Curated annotation (Swiss-Prot), chains B, D, E:
Protein name (database record): Methylcrotonoyl-CoA carboxylase beta chain, mitochondrial
Residues recorded with modification N6-acetyllysine: 48, 473, 489
EC number: 6.4.1.4
Entry coiled-coil feature ranges: none
GO function terms (MF aspect): ATP binding; methylcrotonoyl-CoA carboxylase activity
Chain segments carrying region Carboxyltransferase: 27-533
Species assigned in the record: Homo sapiens (Human)
The CoA carboxyltransferase C-terminal domain, residue ranges: 287-533
Effect of residue 330 to R: In MCC2D; produces severely decreased wild-type residual activity
Effect of residue 124 to N: In MCC2D; has some wild-type residual activity
Swiss-Prot record, chain C:
Name of the protein in its database record: Methylcrotonoyl-CoA carboxylase subunit alpha, mitochondrial
Residue numbers of N6-succinyllysine PTMs: 37
S-S bridge residues: none
Residue(s) carrying N6-acetyllysine: 37
Record function comment: Biotin-attachment subunit of the 3-methylcrotonyl-CoA carboxylase, an enzyme that catalyzes the conversion of 3-methylcrotonyl-CoA to 3-methylglutaconyl-CoA, a critical step for leucine and isovaleric acid catabolism.
Protein's cellular compartments: Mitochondrion matrix
Protein source organism: Homo sapiens
Summary of subunit composition and partner proteins: Probably a dodecamer composed of six biotin-containing alpha subunits (MCCC1) and six beta (MCCC2) subunits. Interacts (via the biotin carboxylation domain) with SIRT4.
Pathology noted in the entry: 3-methylcrotonoyl-CoA carboxylase 1 deficiency: An autosomal recessive disorder of leucine catabolism. The phenotype is variable, ranging from neonatal onset with severe neurological involvement to asymptomatic adults. There is a characteristic organic aciduria with massive excretion of 3-hydroxyisovaleric acid and 3-methylcrotonylglycine, usually in combination with a severe secondary carnitine deficiency.
Source organism, top-level taxon: Eukaryota
Modification after translation, per record: Acetylated.
Length: 82, 541, 91, 541, 541
């Protein structure tokens, strides 16, 4: 729990903060990312939110593309099991 | 046993990131702007007025405070920007009065000094409000009041806003009488002329000190005496230290000069037979694990961008240690326990739009703190309440009201810090000015109004688009900005921190790097009064 | 808050009153201006035996002296010499 | 000035004496019997149940307590023998629940943990009584309650003795609500399944912690959901940490495993903002001047032989110092002032049959202790009241009632230790269970009943000797033991310490060598609550 | 101004309807069964015992009460069915004790009289519980206690269930001492023999009365005196009025016969210097607008059928006037304000399965009544909580707990009436016995248990159908009723009102036509004590 490996375990995947349009996607289908790497930018009720990488795991897949409307708490990125 | 290792908040920001570079640059400019404006206010009336003031043998108002407080002790000044551009053609630096909390003879006291270099010390409407705010702070925290009296009376051209009403000049004496009845010492130091209502201040004080020649105390001034009775008498003869000290008896102590009077004041406070007692548990202080100046890059000046409030918390609490309460429920609100300079504190901060879950989570947290007698700190960065047909059907208003009602009834000391927007009913739920927080501070990037400037513009752009679509004369897009641009300008101007602070809506605009120090001083002062039991109303389940 | 405190302090050397303006800097150092010259001073008090000693740096020059303050006189004893400075007594 | 030399109690026993050798041997066997029985109870349900419990990733109930309390701190377990042979064919080690007082984050707390290895954590009638006793102790001493919840619900075959009455399972939630209203923290840690009434425990707690996958909370279990609505849902989906933590909001903290939950619990207690304050004067502690194990030889196991209670006192009080009150009046009762671990205590102990003088002497002493707010310790070794025509004519009942009435109204903390017999009204006068002593302990040689076994036998041997002498059919001596032997067997069996302790009549059976330590821990816990003023009834002079 | 016209509850039932005819017939049979059983209990021990009792010049226990209370005043007897078939082969009518509330000298008092015709007045385990319940009622309502003492001591064959524990015989004297310290008068009238613990009752009383020859007080009886000291002494010489009145001094008043003693008791109560004061507002009484006996047809005896609880309310409240609170929200629960005999009352009654909305509605209502100090009446007819995956996800347990916690902390007088089923946690939320309602009554058609008999049968029919389906040996439908029939029989037998009332779980079984009168008497008695302020715990929002 102190090791912070737990911080990765607390949530399996990053979800959409609110229902909003996806304005930017910074990750390809297979991309190596480190914690704090921005994955997507979403505007909700004219308010910009940037999604950030939870773990250093490589990205297995992306559930949304640019211009898509993503509902609140819907998975945005799939990460390869390690 | 306190040897358990625990997790700590905060993360290292990306200093190389363009966003951090831009945010730091913008926030730094605001802080520099704030600093230089205070420097100008520091000078009061000006060189000619200051030279005249010293030529009479009197100390400058800020030098008086420096000599009054303990050597090297910090001084927490309040409402430095009162009266900033408040009046069209008159400059009133600091409102003509200097108020703050400092340590005298080891006791925290409220110091209220007239600035005689500003309009001769006349009382403007903002001057009365600033003094009344200081008295309210002193009473709520049981802080002895020291009045360095050097005043020229009320400003006649604006008498209707000074004399008559409940919160007008008359309330000043009412507050003195009430505090005296509660054993909150009232000490007046007449270091200049006081006329009409001014003469009441030394008379209403528990102990009183007057300077040998500068001080004068007359209910009716020489000008009124001549008009009423046709007699010519000097101010010293009509008032003066000798007359009051030896004949009238209004004076309790007689002082040779300003330095002597300040020395006497320190002796008076030392004889109050008061000792501070703490109701809360105390733990050794620890510095935060992250630099405070990083708040510049993290927060910036763009309210549209969002940041994690936990980052702000990580840089002000002891050791960056924070126990979050209901972390995964109502995540738009952050609540938890921490310690600042050893004091226990419950922190409530906005992290997004308020929801029904967030309001319920806040209401639960506030009850916990009140039960354990833990001071509460609010970090307002609001953007409104959730808007939707379903949310109203589920009683979002009912949930939001639950929090307004718990916050109002809480009797633990409450301090509010506006680090972002403050709009609509979100202000009330987060302990706005109307809910009597012990102190209220704002960062230089804050905005406050009934609603955001854009929302008012868009709302009107619906009403008049409707007005002409339903009426039938077409209303074009260029007609839209002849509607929207004046509204946005008004809300931007009236929501500015200086506009809010010029009037006394907050207790000051503070540099983010100074947030931890200001909170530490404020909570320390608020602990001078015992914490009472909290009685709640009906919780509308 | 938002400003720096400068203390006006007077000490007497022999028959000459000297006015020193000390600005208390945020870092814990003190900037002192006497006449037209500004000095950056940082220091601490440490005790060896029963004698308090002042370790100080003025404009980067570092020195150690024994400090005794008795009555209204400040006594600094160093190898380079002994200086006695007086604190003015209020009327 | 505390430098005065004083006399000390106690004398060196004759180790060579045959009586001492026999008494030591008998008492040692009882202590060894007590130790090995506890070892068996320590294992709970058994190897198969324990192996299954660990296979699910859960800690054993006693390992949870070890990790919860401060490192190396003593743990005062209560009612270890609850349910010992209570039910005909079912073995319920410790009643299926572990209760005791330990230090968490430097604060004394009451810990109530279900033993899931015993009948899957089901609530037997004794289980409810043991928990209710623990809650009563926590409330009377203002000890925060920590519930390590892992339960399987009520035991249906015995529902009538669990559900309905005032002191049945429902009272558990009533106690939680009352303690919360008094600011006695209620903390629940869901480390397993809780169903039906069990789900209320986390809901009724001030702060709540649930494990990631093991914990489950639901008013209606999956079996009831399927029967009522014909839906199949797993326990995790119906309950679970994620549902309650993130959606239901029932969970205040989310824990990965048992170790994480225990770490979180320690943090929660540290934020209670509580500091212990003592109402009594304190003096440095001192060990008794005589070994405690000598109590084996002095006391023995034969209740017919008599010993000087002063010998017991000399081996438990600080420095064996004792100030006797009214030493030569009513000598069958011993009263005096002493100190245990620095705390002041007034000791009342039996030294023979109670007389009118003894009762008066006790009543006078109890008033003294209540006036000075001194805790009271009772050492019950009774053999009855004086029997005689003259004594009744002089109002022995009136005198005995004086003591029952003073003891009942006393508001100072009271602790009772049964070191011998406890029969009839002598039990009431010496602060029996019915008189709400903060704690009640018994030595392994004690006997308790309405009257001594022999007296009941002899009394019946008068009634039926009369029955047949007066009726006229002769009743022979062999007919006498067909009357007396069953009675003596019954009273011996029902007066046994294990019989008394299996039901919760006392808080535990303690080794005499541990008497001083147990008393020190108990009095320390009892001092967490402020001592109230004592109001007495009418003293029937 | 109270002249406003208002709506009234209730509707005229269809007397011709077959359902009404059947329901009336079934309920009438239950009431007739209840009446004739009480008639038998009225006779106590029997003709031979009653003839022997009168032959000694003593009044019968119920004749004593008739002469003690004011002429023509109603007498509220409690727990008439205690001990009904409780013991296998022993008949103990009324438990051997008669308890109730009546008016003596214009003051409401609790009367506790031993029935000497039943087993010679020996104390059975139920006898102790009945007396302890009476003392609890007297203390909670500040009712003076009058003990008509004629007892034969504890029942030795069952001593383990009488003597030792906290709620055993010893608690009786503890209660007397506590009430005396609170100025709740304790009056004892020795109208017969009292031995061993019995002798303490007159000794522990504030004022005491003894009959000339019948009464006897001694710690040790003649049989014990002879065995201990070999002396033969008559009971009168050992005890007796003359010895205690003139020599021992245990007696405060000396009475010639039973009639004289009862006359003296009335004089003693008249000198208590007590006057009743009401904390609540009072309005003139009005009879309900509908006959009470119609409740027979409306309710019936079939718990599976449902009825509108408003119909029950319309026939017991003054003028059938009722102000419903949150009528359309959580409609399965009915809450509102009414008046019974002029007293204000808040009524909570079940009208279906409990839901989240119902629990929230109840919690809100209970806070309202506590704020205004309004007594609360609960009408329990429960069938369980809503069962469903969605309901658990929405925290039905969290909502249900809100009500259990509000009801527990409420300090207004609470009275519970079970007019139907009482199962599971629904019992707790509706102020069950465990939640200390001032009084608890049940109708002859009620059923109470941990769960309904059918649910326990069906649940087991899932567990063992699973047991053999999963194991693989088939388990047939005939194997199902060899499982279900014994369970249903057990729950039917143990949920019967007589089973519940034989043990003291309720204060009596009452005829529905008498509901209004019983409630009026009960609320009137409960108002003898001042209403305290209610302190709530944390409401888990
Ligand atoms: O009204 C004009 C000025 C001179 C008369 C005013 C009188 S003097 C007595 C009284 N006290 C005042 O302050 N004003 C009036
Ligand atoms: O009665 C047999 C089992 C299925 C029906 C029981 C119902 S479901 C709704 C209500 N809540 C319970 O716990 N039991 C009843
Ligand atoms: O033990 C057998 C009966 C006679 C001895 C009992 C003694 S008499 C003194 C004391 N008081 C009692 O009630 N019992 C014992």
């Amino acid at each position: 729990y102190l090791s912070s490996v737990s911080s990765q375990e607390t949530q399996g995947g990053p979800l959409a903060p609110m229902t909003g349009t996806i304005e930017k996607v910074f990750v390809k289908a297979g991309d190596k990312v480190k914690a704090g790497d921005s994955l997507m930018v979403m505007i909700a009720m004219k308010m910009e939110h940037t999604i950030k990488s939870p773990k250093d795991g490589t990205v297995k897949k992306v559930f949304y593309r640019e211009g898509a409307q993503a509902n609140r708490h819907t998975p945005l990125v799939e990460f390869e099991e390690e | 046993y306190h040897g358990d290792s625990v997790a700590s908040l905060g993360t290292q920001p990306d200093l190389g990131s363009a966003l951090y570079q831009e945010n730091y640059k913008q926030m730094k400019a605001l802080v520099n702007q704030l600093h230089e404006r205070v420097e100008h206010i520091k000078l009061g009336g000006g060189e000619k007025a200051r030279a005249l003031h010293i030529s009479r043998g009197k100390l400058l108002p800020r030098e008086r405070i420096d000599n009054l407080i303990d050597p090297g002790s910090p001084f927490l000044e309040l409402s430095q920007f009162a009266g900033y551009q408040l009046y069209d053609n008159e400059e009133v630096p600091g409102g003509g009065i200097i108020t703050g909390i400092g340590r005298v003879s080891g006791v925290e006291c409220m110091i209220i000094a007239n600035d005689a270099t500003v309009k001769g010390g006349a009382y403007y409407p903002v001057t009365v409000k600033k003094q009344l705010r200081a008295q309210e702070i002193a009473m709520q925290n049981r802080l002895p009041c020291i009045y360095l009296v050097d005043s020229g009376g009320a400003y006649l051209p604006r008498q209707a806003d000074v004399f008559p009403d409940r919160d007008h000049f008359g309330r000043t004496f009412y507050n003195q009488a009430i505090m005296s009845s509660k054993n909150i010492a009232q000490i007046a130091v007449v270091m200049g002329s006081c006329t009409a209502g001014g003469a009441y201040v030394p008379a209403m004080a528990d102990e009183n000190i007057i300077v040998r020649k500068q001080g004068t105390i007359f209910l009716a001034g020489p000008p009124l005496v001549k008009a009423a009775t046709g007699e010519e008498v000097s101010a010293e003869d009509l008032g003066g230290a000798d007359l009051h000290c030896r004949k009238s008896g209004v004076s309790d102590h007689w002082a040779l000069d300003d330095h002597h009077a300040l020395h006497l004041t320190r002796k008076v406070v030392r004889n109050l037979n008061y000792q501070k007692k703490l109701d809360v548990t105390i733990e050794p202080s620890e510095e935060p694990l992250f630099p405070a100046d990083e708040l510049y890059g993290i927060v910036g000046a763009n309210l549209k961008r969002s940041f994690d409030v936990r980052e702000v918390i990580a840089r002000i609490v002891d050791g960056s240690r924070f126990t979050e309460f209901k972390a995964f429920y109502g995540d738009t609100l952050v609540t938890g326990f921490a310690r600042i300079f050893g004091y226990p504190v419950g922190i409530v901060g906005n992290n997004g739009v308020l929801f029904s879950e967030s309001a319920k989570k806040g209401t639960h947290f506030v009850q916990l703190c009140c039960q354990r007698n833990i001071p509460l700190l609010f970090l307002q960065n609001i953007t409104g309440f959730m808007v939707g047909r379903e949310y109203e059907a589920e009683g979002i208003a009912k949930d939001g009201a639950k929090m307004v009602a718990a916050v109002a009834c809480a009797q633990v000391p409450k301090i509010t810090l506006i680090i972002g927007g403050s709009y609509g009913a979100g202000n009330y739920g987060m302990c706005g000015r109307a809910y009597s927080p012990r102190f209220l501070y704002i960062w230089p990037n804050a905005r406050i109004s009934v609603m955001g400037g854009e929302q008012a513009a868009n709302v009107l752009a619906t009403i008049t688009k409707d007005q002409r679509a339903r009426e039938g004369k077409q209303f074009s897009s260029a007609d839209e900005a002849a509607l929207k641009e004046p509204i946005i300008k008004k809300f931007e101007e009236e929501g500015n921190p200086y506009y809010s602070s010029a009037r006394v809506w907050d207790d000051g605009i503070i540099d983010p790097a100074d947030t931890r120090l200001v909170l530490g001083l404020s909570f320390s002062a608020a602990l001078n009064a015992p914490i009472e039991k909290t009685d709640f109303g009906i919780f509308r389940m | 808050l938002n400003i720096s405190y400068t203390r006006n302090m007077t000490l007497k050397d022999g028959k000459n009153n000297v006015a020193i303006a000390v600005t208390y800097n945020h870092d814990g150092s003190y900037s002192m201006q006497i006449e037209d010259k500004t000095f950056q001073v940082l220091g601490n008090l440490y005790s060896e035996g029963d004698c308090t000693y002042l370790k100080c740096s003025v404009n980067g020059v570092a020195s150690k002296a024994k400090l005794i303050i008795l009555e209204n006189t400040i006594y600094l004893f160093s190898k380079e010499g002994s200086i006695e400075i007086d604190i003015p007594v209020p009327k």
